[PDB]
Ligand binder design. Structure first.
Ligand SMILES: Nc1nc2c(ncn2[C@@H]2O[C@H](COP(=O)(O)OP(=O)(O)O)[C@@H](O)[C@H]2O)c(=O)[nH]1
Ligand SMILES: Nc1nc2c(ncn2[C@@H]2O[C@H](COP(=O)(O)OP(=O)(O)O)[C@@H](O)[C@H]2O)c(=O)[nH]1
Ligand SMILES: [Mg+2]
Ligand SMILES: [Mg+2]
Ligand SMILES: [Mg+2]
Ligand SMILES: [Mg+2]
Lengths: 224, 224
């Protein structure tokens, strides 16, 4: 087949999508699985002044595989506003609704040249892109598998389960992975006991990202 | 009929359930709608040393209607652990799984003496109480209407919509209300534009709690 595609969403902005995506792509590349990082939509940016956005960090990693890549090759809709993409678009670019059909074509083109195409969303699954589509809808259009990154703070149980409920209600392969900090041992006392119980009782377990690079690469590449 | 019952859940712990519940009960009581505040399950407490838990604050308000109330009349399962109730129960009281049938009876008894019985949950909708039941399941057993309090920070759109999706998928009347801080005008710039759009497109709109005391009292009391 052409390259596999993995969408990365999260419980929350700042949960760890970009960090975990970069660590996963680094691992995949080190294993000989040629992997590109894309950020098709990004808010809260000012490219004239700042070169540390998600798409910039992705570009730096990606140029280890293709020196010719530029920011516009890997990120397509970029806004100054810190808001959902739909709202930034309506305010900053009212004449140009985000075209997810076009994005689906651009992203799928990278499956020609890469074994794995990692696509970071913005915000969370329900975050609106257009009047009709949210980030989950975009992932469904892409026919990507899904990796949902969770925070490791109090309340992760609820956040993970709300996303589990939404994901299991739609027709896509997914995994939920906790982005665990190593100074955080409260996790192991407070939340982990329930993650363990849940995993005995669920066919799709919640994993810890940092323990799961091999299984997540396997997940991303499996099947058609 | 006997008194109505309103369950109060949230996007997150610390979202505002207790503050908003107390403000709603105060408003209801001031309007002649006799209203009790209950906290059947509470974690993170130490009643030997601290008298500022949710059940304590509820008790103070409630004693304006019944001097005879004590903490044990309004809160039934209390744990030291900061965790989901299921986990606190397994650790601190392994022989006594939380009995939601018993809680349903105790809570419904207050519908004899009150026009409105407000029941604050713990944690979020998906937070586990027993191996089989979460907070939403408990609310469904209670046949309560639901008020879900949202935080007013970045990411509220996603959190509200994840809860909307879960709630609209089950057979209960609900409202989602944002607990807005008055020093927060970023809300109006960043999130409100989407709340407005959503509300044009949804039969069940997301409201701002502070604007909505009358409509929420109406909601709580309507119908059977
Ligand atoms: C950590 O937590 C912050 C947010 O992480 P990031 O990986 O960008 O999260 P994301 O917003 O979900 O993509 C960063 O400063 C990281 O270094
Ligand atoms: C505010 O934010 C904190 C948490 O609010 P609270 O009403 O207790 O939220 P809850 O945990 O959702 O019940 C408190 O210190 C309030 O005064
Ligand atoms: Mg971010
Ligand atoms: Mg990011
Ligand atoms: Mg609290
Ligand atoms: Mg509370």
């Amino acid at each position: 087949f052409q390259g596999h595609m993995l969408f990365i969403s999260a419980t929350n902005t700042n949960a760890g999508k970009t960090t975990c995506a970069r660590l996963l792509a680094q691992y995949c590349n080190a294993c000989g699985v040629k992997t590109i990082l894309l950020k098709p939509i990004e808010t809260g940016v000012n490219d004239a002044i700042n070169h540390s956005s998600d798409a910039h960090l992705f570009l730096q990693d990606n140029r280890l595989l293709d020196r010719s890549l530029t920011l516009k090759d890997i990120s397509f809709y970029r806004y100054h506003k810190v808001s959902a993409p739909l709202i930034a678009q309506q305010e900053e670019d009212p004449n140009a609704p985000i075209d997810t059909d076009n994005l689906t074509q651009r992203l799928h083109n990278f499956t020609k040249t890469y074994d794995l195409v990692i696509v970071e969303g913005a915000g969370g699954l329900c975050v609106p892109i257009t009047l009709e589509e949210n980030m989950l809808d975009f992932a469904l259009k892409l026919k990507a598998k899904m990796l949902l990154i969770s925070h490791d703070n109090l309340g992760l149980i609820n956040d993970c389960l709300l996303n589990d409920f939404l994901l299991k209600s739609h027709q896509l392969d997914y995994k939920i992975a906790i982005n665990l900090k190593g100074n955080n041992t409260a996790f192991h006392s407070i939340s982990l006991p329930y993650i363990e119980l849940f995993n005995t009782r669920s066919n799709n377990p919640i994993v810890i990202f940092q323990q799961s690079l091999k299984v997540l690469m396997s997940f991303a590449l499996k099947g058609s």
